[PDB]
Write a structure and sequence with these properties.
2 copies of one chain form a homodimer. In chain A, 43% of the residues lie in helices and 14% in strands. Chain A is α+β, with helices and mostly antiparallel strands and 207 residues long. In chain A, a hairpin with a 2-residue loop joins strand 3 and strand 4. The radius of gyration of chain A is 21 Å and the shape is globular. The interface between A and B is medium-sized, with 30 and 29 residues.
Chain lengths: 207, 205
């Protein structure tokens, strides 16, 4: 037709994009209190997270076999959507907090929060401190004296492939960090945390 | 055990909230689509262009159907959950207005309804539509012979046309228009919601 129509169709599209974010915010606002109440019940189920993480179909493929003993110490996982804090954040942005009860003589009891947010878009993050297990001293990047050597590079990559390497993932150095750090982050915010109860129930039906 | 009971209740609330969010979206989008479609009724061959621009739509119908699809000057999808709580938020009706082709395809408006039956599957009911005279030999309601090898070929040809799709129900696997459910979702999930995008993309080329 003419231009006058193409214009109306232009403003309509912008009204649609605005509606979509309003809808996402609407959902986030409604779900926040339900998660709080749900997580209160979860905090009363020992090894809830260990069971959920084992039931997930692909979680295990992201971390090293040896990491599981440390993952088993997770007492709580909490995901919070940042768009609820400010419209300056994408509705896909979230922080994830882990509480590890630790292992005497090997892994420190600690709480760690990592923040994921969209840039220019793709998920990105900043490194967050976490006390690696003593067992990992030889593959720990901050204790790694020899990274250059062909034997050092091997150990370096090994450490970077552990869940602890994921905590320093940023998404800004393609191929240089923990592999698929963004996919793992999305796994937590879109599948593991939202549907943990469904996974747990499934593990129950299996006696 | 009181925890498991609490979790069960939370999951129930989650499902209730998801429906509420979907209805919230549907209600907000309704007036926008109405205004949008008003501007659309001002662009000639709008739908003809969108349907030819879509990447997979043409793969669902027969080449011979293109000329009839080109006569569509109006497509309207309506979500039934806005009508009642007994409809799934995925249930919808799609209304087509064909301008027709004189002496071959009658000018007509047809509405087909798609609804979930049990996470459930999309189903529909046959809806009346006047097939083109050119399709007389492959029209299931006119064919006398649907048994011979030749009669069966003509039968299948007709059932694979867009007119056979209006007859699709999703309740007779392997006996109806192929992938009638995917085509339906194409309309409600891509073609109708993003038609304007397809129209702009067609302008550049």
């Amino acid at each position: 037709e003419h231009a006058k129509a193409f214009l109306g169709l232009a403003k309509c599209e912008e009204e649609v994009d605005a509606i979509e974010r309003e809808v996402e915010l609407y959902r986030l606002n409604k779900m926040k209190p339900v998660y709080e109440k749900r997580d209160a019940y979860i905090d009363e189920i020992a090894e809830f997270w260990k069971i959920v993480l084992s039931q997930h179909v692909s979680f295990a493929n992201y971390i090293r076999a040896s990491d599981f003993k440390y993952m088993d110490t997770i007492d709580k996982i909490k995901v919070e959507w940042l768009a609820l804090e400010s419209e300056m954040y994408d509705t896909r942005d979230f922080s994830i907090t882990f509480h590890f009860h630790g292992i005497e003589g090997d892994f420190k009891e600690q709480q760690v929060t990592k923040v994921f947010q969209i840039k220019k878009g793709i998920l990105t993050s900043e490194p967050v401190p976490i006390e690696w297990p003593q067992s990992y001293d030889s593959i720990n990047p901050d204790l790694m004296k020899d990274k250059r050597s062909p034997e050092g590079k091997k150990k370096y990559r090994q450490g970077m492939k552990t869940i602890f390497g994921w905590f320093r993932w940023t998404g800004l150095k393609p191929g240089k960090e923990f592999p698929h750090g963004d996919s793992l982050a999305s796994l937590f915010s879109e599948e593991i945390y939202p549907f943990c109860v469904k996974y747990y129930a499934e593990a129950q039906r299996d006696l």
